Amino acid sequence: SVWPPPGLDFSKPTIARVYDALLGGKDNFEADRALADYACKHIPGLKESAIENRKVLVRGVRFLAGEAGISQFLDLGSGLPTVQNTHEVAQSVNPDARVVYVDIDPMVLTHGRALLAKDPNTAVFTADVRDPEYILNHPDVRRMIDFSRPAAIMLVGMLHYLSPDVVDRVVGAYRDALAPGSYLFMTSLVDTGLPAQQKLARITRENLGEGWARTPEEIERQFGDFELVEPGVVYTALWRPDEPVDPDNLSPGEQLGMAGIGRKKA
Ligand SMILES: C[S@+](CC[C@H](N)C(=O)[O-])C[C@H]1O[C@@H](n2cnc3c(N)ncnc32)[C@H](O)[C@@H]1O
Q: Which residues make up the binding site for S-adenosyl-L-methionine (predicted)?
């Protein structure tokens, strides 16, 4: 078998591969599809929640690279590739945009290295986001991002994998690295008291190692002093929609996660 690489199959699911399976990608093994299937059986709207997270990723990156004028992105916990990735969105509005992707799953590097050796403004590497010091000093980071100028750091679909004991220091390190005029874009599994939210967090914790549903206020808090851009921290489908959407008529899948983008002030 030539793909996914058999040497990466330990009959254990990974976060990247399961999310890929939820989106209908082929970068996954049976253990990943089995867990996605199981999760969908217990968690209504799970796949739709992933779709909405990808759609807000696109809308947010388009806001950042176009309107906000940002040319430098650090995409933490990037995941495996989809039909619309960060650098593709960024370059569609801003041909000079530069994106550095970071993921812990080696399959992300293996797939991507292929796709991105032809792009001098896009780089990918394997690392653990819980070690900001290592990521912020990596040669791909240092050669691609000048942190003395505005940048965007993204923890899209990533915040709920940071435990209570590490989250404050980890997200704080990345906020602290940024120049005034920079942005932090995150999305997260949310606890608004709907039953599936904490059940989904449990399944993720038990099967994938980490999974923390945060209240809207706990999500907002991880933006620190940054100034939230309108509409603030809201269900992912409600974040600057480009397609009609009614906040009182959301499905269960549209209430699993929230999105927010905040700006660092001078
Ligand atoms: C794939 S899902 C979200 C993907 C993408 N950011 C999105 O929102 O569409 C979460 C991703 O975060 C990565 N991840 C979780 N914890 C990580 C960590 N501590 N260091 C690096 N990557 C991590 C997973 O491997 C996975 O690829």
A: 19, 53-54, 103, 128-129
